[PDB]
């Protein structure tokens, strides 16, 4: 079914089964590698990005693109495991609005990744296009001295690709603010665009 | 005489295929070109303004949706972005037969073949699939449910 | 049945004649030559309404099947024109609502509701035109079509209710059953005349471009 | 879809004879496409359609 070729094929009156040349299970396996190993993986990745890139903002984008690579991928089978081989009962509801899908990061994205829950999902005071999630003690960047906050844009990239498939294009930033005795908690103050806010603003 | 499409977010067909019953032994001669993208392009229009509302609890599957003046169409919307469309029907009769549950056990069943190909990290979005194996799998997966 | 035919032809001709000859353009109202009409500034189809009421009553009492939907067309045009534009809150459609009770589609009390109801009534009566097998408007008597009048019937329907779904969204909305109720061209439509096809596809395309359904 | 809808636009512009539009849209068909046009799907029976463009002053 090539782009150059047409949609042409042949009749159904034979059997191609199984011909899996490679098709397997896809279930939630558990192998649980050490945080030192993945921390070294992230470590030499950030070393490559400070090698090859000029200044602050382009490095921030050239970090968040990895999150945009695999955010779509984690979205669709995390939803296919949570809201649903595959002797399937059903697939449940999609994103209704913004407040179920940023509950869906809050419910089962962090507990898919980091075995806990980010502690709040605060709807903002002054506006509604801006939303803010704070992780309390970020797991994959706990060793980096976070005075530059440029090193946590893995996870701003990974949630932006959780919402760009969801139809909400969104400016996603991170800041870090020590509001509690919990130190080095990072706020992901996200935004949206006006238009799916106005698609929410048609009826709410 | 059955016609599969997977049509993307920026209108690109990431997988589109026909097949035929040998009891028809061909498919829609001289009708195979109007029953292509334009009908499917309007099908993208009706699933575009049918997905985002709750109401015209199974948000993914939608069943038979519309009808041009020779046949009728069915649909499916995934949260991956993609909108699966099968176009079925013998060209002589107006084919009424929407099985609605056993071909519901096709759309959630072809979904994982899209999943494992999406999980190929060399595979991008917005590019079609010349898998020699996943297209030979689906006709035999349609050998389950004709 | 001869009395029914005589009353049908006379009532249809009188309904269309007193319709088009009352308030054709009545913003200056040249009151000379007052033979065929009142023709003053207060002459807006009132005798046309009374004549169309008696015409629809005699058409229902005639019991046609082909020409009889033109009585509903006359009453719907009366309640559209003389009870919308130059109405001045008169809306004298009591025998029109009586014919809505008698033949089809009573029980409505709003603008864009009873017009839709009587449009459904006239569409059902033209569906009840099963086989006239004759010639009534005698422009064509052997090569003509009931298709060629029914496409004009529902495009009158489509232009007179498709605009009511405003493109300011929340202002005057109804459900998007316009496409659902627009897929009604099951007929063949293979070139009776090319300008009918051009105006039918221009309006069918223009309403989709109006409602934002491009494809 | 662009191949089919430009083929329809080129056939209208033949039948109604707007020669700068058969010039414009067939030049845009040849430039922006034809990796999917071998000597079949009317490319051999095409370019006869644009020698009237070049015997005109069009392109």
XYZ file of C-alpha atoms in Angstrom, chain A residues 14-172:
159
model
C -6.476 -18.087 -0.139
C -4.855 -18.160 3.333
C -1.933 -15.941 4.514
C -2.306 -17.025 8.199
C -0.299 -16.967 10.408
C 2.755 -15.265 8.768
C 3.693 -13.323 11.964
C 7.303 -12.887 10.666
C 7.198 -11.247 14.127
C 4.159 -10.594 16.319
C 4.084 -11.262 20.052
C 2.465 -10.214 23.297
C 2.509 -6.605 24.438
C 1.477 -6.909 28.096
C 2.774 -5.098 31.170
C 6.027 -6.890 31.778
C 8.108 -6.174 34.859
C 11.890 -6.133 34.753
C 12.716 -3.021 36.837
C 16.237 -1.849 36.081
C 18.235 0.214 38.533
C 17.968 3.998 38.755
C 21.739 4.266 38.340
C 21.563 2.689 34.862
C 18.762 4.886 33.527
C 20.353 7.846 35.306
C 23.581 7.197 33.386
C 21.560 6.945 30.164
C 19.948 10.332 30.836
C 23.355 11.622 31.982
C 25.223 10.976 28.783
C 22.191 12.150 26.764
C 22.319 15.574 28.454
C 26.088 15.529 27.880
C 25.486 15.120 24.119
C 22.935 17.930 24.116
C 25.240 20.367 25.886
C 27.885 19.322 23.375
C 25.957 19.848 20.162
C 23.672 22.800 20.902
C 24.213 26.546 21.048
C 22.298 28.291 23.811
C 19.391 27.879 26.233
C 16.137 27.757 24.269
C 17.217 25.643 21.316
C 18.657 23.105 23.776
C 15.298 23.150 25.583
C 13.522 22.319 22.319
C 16.205 19.767 21.400
C 15.499 18.085 24.707
C 11.690 18.169 24.458
C 11.677 16.556 20.987
C 12.502 13.148 22.551
C 9.394 13.497 24.655
C 7.494 14.317 21.499
C 8.928 11.193 19.917
C 7.709 8.787 22.564
C 4.768 10.652 24.115
C 2.387 9.430 21.408
C 3.691 5.899 21.878
C 3.209 5.855 25.642
C -0.213 7.545 25.294
C -1.852 4.969 23.155
C -0.909 1.743 24.927
C -1.042 3.307 28.390
C -4.640 4.132 27.509
C -5.003 0.686 25.898
C -3.914 -0.899 29.165
C -5.712 1.417 31.604
C -9.070 2.040 29.900
C -9.251 -1.462 28.402
C -3.757 -11.689 22.673
C -6.154 -8.961 23.889
C -9.400 -10.714 24.783
C -10.900 -7.293 25.020
C -13.918 -6.313 27.078
C -14.109 -2.722 25.815
C -12.156 0.437 25.314
C -13.494 3.158 27.605
C -14.025 6.871 27.185
C -11.585 9.168 25.472
C -10.663 12.676 26.526
C -13.868 14.490 27.329
C -12.313 17.823 28.211
C -9.079 19.059 29.715
C -9.838 18.041 33.296
C -10.067 14.309 32.710
C -6.958 14.177 30.565
C -4.823 16.078 33.051
C -6.341 13.789 35.602
C -5.055 11.009 33.375
C -1.491 12.225 33.742
C -2.225 12.553 37.457
C -3.898 9.176 37.756
C -1.812 6.731 35.776
C 1.104 8.335 33.950
C 3.344 8.961 36.968
C 2.313 5.623 38.449
C 3.194 4.102 35.105
C 6.594 5.773 35.204
C 7.721 6.629 38.731
C 5.483 4.406 40.941
C 3.709 7.320 42.683
C 1.440 10.309 41.981
C 2.314 13.978 41.518
C 0.757 15.668 44.488
C -1.500 18.299 42.879
C -3.209 19.229 39.605
C -4.102 22.822 40.469
C -6.430 24.775 38.227
C -4.986 28.277 38.121
C -6.439 31.305 39.878
C -6.243 34.212 37.463
C -6.724 32.392 34.134
C -7.983 29.138 32.648
C -5.671 28.525 29.681
C -2.840 28.032 32.163
C -2.725 24.881 34.271
C -0.080 23.691 36.662
C 1.126 20.325 37.918
C 3.870 20.135 40.532
C 5.967 17.073 41.073
C 7.301 17.104 44.608
C 10.614 15.337 44.270
C 11.406 14.616 40.601
C 12.840 11.187 40.144
C 14.948 11.198 36.997
C 16.677 14.528 37.680
C 17.224 14.340 41.453
C 21.032 14.275 41.131
C 21.388 17.300 38.876
C 21.768 20.518 40.912
C 18.622 22.112 39.563
C 19.522 25.804 39.763
C 19.383 25.712 36.020
C 15.948 24.283 35.396
C 16.815 23.307 31.828
C 17.384 19.681 32.783
C 13.773 18.774 33.550
C 12.519 19.425 30.036
C 12.423 15.732 29.372
C 9.124 15.628 31.190
C 7.680 18.815 29.693
C 8.395 17.230 26.348
C 6.818 13.973 27.438
C 3.541 15.527 28.561
C 3.292 17.803 25.524
C 3.257 14.682 23.377
C 0.610 13.372 25.682
C -1.595 16.330 24.798
C -0.680 17.041 21.180
C -2.257 13.726 20.216
C -5.122 14.695 22.498
C -5.924 17.707 20.324
C -4.832 20.389 22.786
C -1.772 22.189 21.433
C -0.127 23.629 24.446
C 2.810 25.709 25.570
C 4.338 23.618 28.332
